Design a protein around this ligand. Sequence first.
Ligand SMILES: Cc1cc2nc3c(=O)[nH]c(=O)nc-3n(C[C@H](O)[C@H](O)[C@H](O)COP(=O)(O)OP(=O)(O)OC[C@H]3O[C@@H](n4cnc5c(N)ncnc54)[C@H](O)[C@@H]3O)c2cc1C
Length: 295
Amino acid sequence: DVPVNLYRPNAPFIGKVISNEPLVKEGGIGIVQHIKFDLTGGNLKYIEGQSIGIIPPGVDKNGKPEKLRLYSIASTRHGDDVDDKTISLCVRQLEYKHPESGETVYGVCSTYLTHIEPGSEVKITGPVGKEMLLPDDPEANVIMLATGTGIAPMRTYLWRMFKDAERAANPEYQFKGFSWLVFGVPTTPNILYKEELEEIQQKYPDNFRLTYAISREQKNPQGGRMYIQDRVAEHADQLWQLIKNQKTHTYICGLRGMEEGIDAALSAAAAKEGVTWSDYQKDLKKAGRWHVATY
Ligand SMILES: Cc1cc2nc3c(=O)[nH]c(=O)nc-3n(C[C@H](O)[C@H](O)[C@H](O)COP(=O)(O)OP(=O)(O)OC[C@H]3O[C@@H](n4cnc5c(N)ncnc54)[C@H](O)[C@@H]3O)c2cc1C
């Protein structure tokens, strides 16, 4: 029933860019774009928490055709306009500099995507992934631990749970559990989808909690910059108490490196009740209730 690999890299779906909109506001670090593609003419279907591949044009430094890069889907199954016609991505332009070249180096696929014009044709593959799926149970609790573009799957969950047009389109999923997003970014300008996330918490104060870790604006209790691992530590008991529920799912997404601190915080919380978190987490993983996609 889960859609997978309706298109493959040997014969991709050629979609058209509808829009390319900035998500980083003035004063922010870097470039993150919300990109919506037209799926009409093909049969690419997908659900929340999945990814698609993008094949950028050109050859690599060895003259080989560029391979696909995976991007978390940022829209629900219905698309941003709830019409079942589009799919959206949340793409950061990769930029770093030296012990890999010259000065500033720009990622191939991400630079291609962030600068792409409406009307352009794009090679799309997928969808892919079954490890970040949202439960059908409307009484599930959902913890979301995201940094940067790791917000993308979280957006698909939250929009499905809480958007007016989504609730109207999805008779059989009227979310009534509790969801908690802890989202780490460097600045307030860098809070991707800020306005809509805060609008959701305002209309559903009992079903959605929003916690920021803003590194350039906040310090942890030890005086370092505030990161997501610091907020999880700050709320470790609360998060552990939620995780003990048989219906609670946790999702972690973003660039690698977050998980070690999250585990240390939850390990100290669980230890207070004689539970070794690493073991409990293994069982959660097996049960399909601990979801991770880092990159
Ligand atoms: C399941 C999954 C989902 C993803 N979802 C998203 C998403 O929603 N949004 C998003 O923006 N990205 C996402 N990514 C990452 C994305 O696929 C691409 O890896 C990323 O966009 C960079 O690709 P590129 O073509 O721009 O870079 P490339 O041109 O391939 O550059 C990357 C290469 O350069 C090197 N490199 C990268 N960073 C550094 C650094 N700091 N220092 C030194 N060398 C470095 C490495 O060799 C790396 O392989 C996801 C990845 C996966 C696996």
